[PDB]
Write an enzyme that holds these catalytic residues in place. Structure first.
Site, short mmCIF file in Angstrom:
data_model
loop_
_atom_site.label_atom_id
_atom_site.label_comp_id
_atom_site.label_asym_id
_atom_site.label_seq_id
_atom_site.Cartn_x
_atom_site.Cartn_y
_atom_site.Cartn_z
N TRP A 29 0.78 -1.32 0.10
CA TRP A 29 0.17 0.07 -0.02
C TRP A 29 1.40 0.96 -0.27
CZ3 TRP A 29 -1.78 3.97 2.75
CH2 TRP A 29 -2.72 4.87 2.71
N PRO A 72 -25.11 13.33 13.56
CA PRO A 72 -26.80 12.67 13.82
C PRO A 72 -27.05 11.86 12.50
CG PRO A 72 -26.92 15.39 13.59
CD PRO A 72 -25.73 15.10 13.70
N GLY A 93 9.16 0.71 20.25
CA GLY A 93 7.66 0.57 20.20
C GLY A 93 6.94 1.81 19.31
N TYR A 131 -5.13 -2.71 20.04
CA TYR A 131 -5.98 -1.22 19.44
C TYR A 131 -6.75 -1.76 20.76
CZ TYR A 131 -4.56 -0.39 14.81
#
Lengths: 154, 39
Positions: A29, A72, A93, A131
């Site tokens: 990518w 909304p 890290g 995550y």
């Protein structure tokens, strides 16, 4: 040790070849579908380099998104599409360093435009564990889609 | 994928879980503590 520069938008003089993260998909990518999505103006790719060089050692991507029902109202969000780090930086890290920059980034973003959460799709559970160790929560959109809700700055 | 289109019931479940108070507060503290040293 490895010393790195601050995350910055991908240019065309950036050194993208020596980057090796472990997933050929995420290194491809960066080589291929990074510059292209940016001139198209969909996602924006942020990269870090080795100090005094331009050799990329880590990167992440950011595009907006939405959630709506089938007839909304659209929920304004931001997708963290890719987060990867070169295999020659390990216990340094730099992943947590990139996710900090990204989240901070989107929070500043949300002080310009309404943004209700960041979303991410966990590849393996190690993505999910990374995550979930840093705030993300399992959502209902998709079983690998986790969300990090955004609160206004100040 | 960039536009999640959901049936009515998934949409309410997503909405409620989003208007709910923030969760995984523990990690967010951990992430908010990662002070990086960029150059």
């Amino acid at each position: 040790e490895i010393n790195v520069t601050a995350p910055a938008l991908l240019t065309d003089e950036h050194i993208l070849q020596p980057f090796d993260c472990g997933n050929e998909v995420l290194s491809n990518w960066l080589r291929g579908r990074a510059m292209k999505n940016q001139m198209l103006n969909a996602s924006r790719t942020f990269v870090i380099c080795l100090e005094d060089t331009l050799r990329i050692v880590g990167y992440y991507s950011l595009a907006t998104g939405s959630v709506t029902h089938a007839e909304p109202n659209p929920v304004p969000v931001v997708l963290l599409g890719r987060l990867a780090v070169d295999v020659c930086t390990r216990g340094h890290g730099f992943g947590k360093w990139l996710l900090s920059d990204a989240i901070h980034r989107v929070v500043n973003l949300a002080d310009q435009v309404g943004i209700k959460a960041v979303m991410v799709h966990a590849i393996d559970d190690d993505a999910r564990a990374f995550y979930e160790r840093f705030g993300f929560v399992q959502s209902v959109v998709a079983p690998n889609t986790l969300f990090y809700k955004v609160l206004e700055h100040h | 994928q960039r536009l999640f289109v959901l049936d009515n019931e998934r949409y309410d479940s997503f909405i409620t879980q989003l208007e709910a108070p923030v969760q995984n507060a523990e990690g967010r503290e951990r992430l908010m503590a990662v002070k990086p040293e960029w150059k």
